[PDB]
Every structure is written in C-alpha cells, then in structure tokens.
Symmetry: C2
C-alpha cells in the first residue's frame, strides 16, 4: 500500500532516514473509513498509529477532545505508555489513513535506539502541535 517517499511530505516522517521510511512502510497499510465509523475506542490496546491523509477525525469520550485534519497523526498512545487509547476516534467525513502497526513500532523502538528516539520526539512534537 504505502509508497514511502510519499510519507516524507508529512511532518512526522519528514526527518526519518531512507531506511527508516522503508522499514515503517513495510508495517503500514493505507486504510479507508466511512463517515461516522468508530476507528478505535478509548481503553483499547493502542495497536495502531495513524496518519490522516484525507477527511476528518474527532477524538472524543463516549465530549469532543480534539479534531484532526490531514497531515496530522492520531492514535499516539501506540507509542506512549501504558499504550491504551485515551480517547476514541471517529470519522467526521470520508477518511483515508496510513495505518501503522503499533506493536511493531514498539519493538523497533526498543531494538533500534535511533528510531526509538526520533519516533518519541516526533510523537511529542505532534501532540504539542495540537494546541497550536
């Protein structure tokens, strides 16, 4: 699915080495969700990190927490202990995402200090940017 020079245009991925992008692409898949679908649920194991390519996502409690627009990541608890979603996510328009295997990212972060450092930095930057 994921043809990873395309990933570089997005902030979260723009700083990664070529090998790192190929590696992340291998564990990623393009996915679509229809308007109103619940993409993931609060309290579930965070096994998917997503990059929004098209459409709109609301992070909410089943009160809205946050609205996501294309180019931004969500499912960030896939890389933040204790790795359970702190909110649910739903599509507010037809949605396409890059769906990244969070269990794999966690392994790779543990075994590859360099990738672990950049991923955590970038997650932190992404969540910081939600209030800007």
């Amino acid at each position: 699915m994921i043809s990873p020079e395309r990933l570089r245009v997005y902030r979260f991925f723009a700083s990664l080495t070529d090998e790192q992008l190929k590696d992340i692409a291998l564990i990623s898949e393009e996915k679509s969700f229809p308007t109103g679908s619940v993409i993931f649920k609060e309290n579930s194991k965070a096994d998917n990190l997503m990059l929004l390519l098209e459409g709109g996502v609301e992070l909410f409690y089943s009160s809205t927490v946050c609205s996501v627009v294309p180019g931004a990541i969500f499912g960030v608890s896939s890389l933040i202990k204790p790795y359970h979603y702190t909110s649910s996510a739903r599509a507010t328009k037809p949605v396409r995402v890059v769906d990244i295997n969070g269990a794999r990212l966690r392994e790779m972060s543990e075994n590859n200090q360099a990738l672990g450092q950049v991923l955590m930095n970038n997650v932190a930057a992404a969540v910081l940017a939600r209030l800007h």
Copy 2:
C-alpha cells in the same frame, strides 16, 4: 532546594527510579515568579523544564494557548527538538516551580538511554494530557 522524595508525588516524576530522582534533583531548583511576570519567551532556547507547584501559568503568543495548574509540567520543548519554546509563559497568580536544567536533561537523555526513554515518554504523556 529540591528534596526529591517530594518530586514522586507528581505524575511526571512518579515512575522514575530513586537514582534518577536524585540525579534530576541535583539539576533542579525551586523558583518563584510574581503575577504577570514572563517566565520564558517564545522562540528562546528551551533551557528550562518546569513543574508547577503553586499558582497558575498561561502559555500564550505575544492569544492564549493553554492554562497550566499545579502538578503539571511546562517548557516541554526543553526535551523536544528543535528545543526552542513554541509559546511564551506567564504567571497568572503567584507562582512556585521546580526549575530543571534542560541542557543537563538533554545530556543525560543522550548518555543514559534508560532516562532518555522515560523522560520522552513522560513528556509525550504530559502534552497529551493537556487536551484531557
């Protein structure tokens, strides 16, 4: 200043080992700021990570971005590349903080993979919690 069993009651520090807390205490100092003081400025090198002990802080552009209450951290770009404050901070009431040397945290993060991992996780969790 910082008598570091006291640090454990706060979320950011509660998970650290005893050695890690002693180490962070060594590079920390209790500081006070009066109402209306600008604690740090947008675009400055992020050389101070702060834990709010008492009072109130507004993160703003010179529009408000975020309000901080006791028990929460701010100055998070001290650990997020490229390490420049993304907003200014001002006291909205009389403020006391734990002021942590960000340059030292960065060194320690680089030289001690274990501390680096926990600090980045905890920074990410802290910024995530701002929308909850």
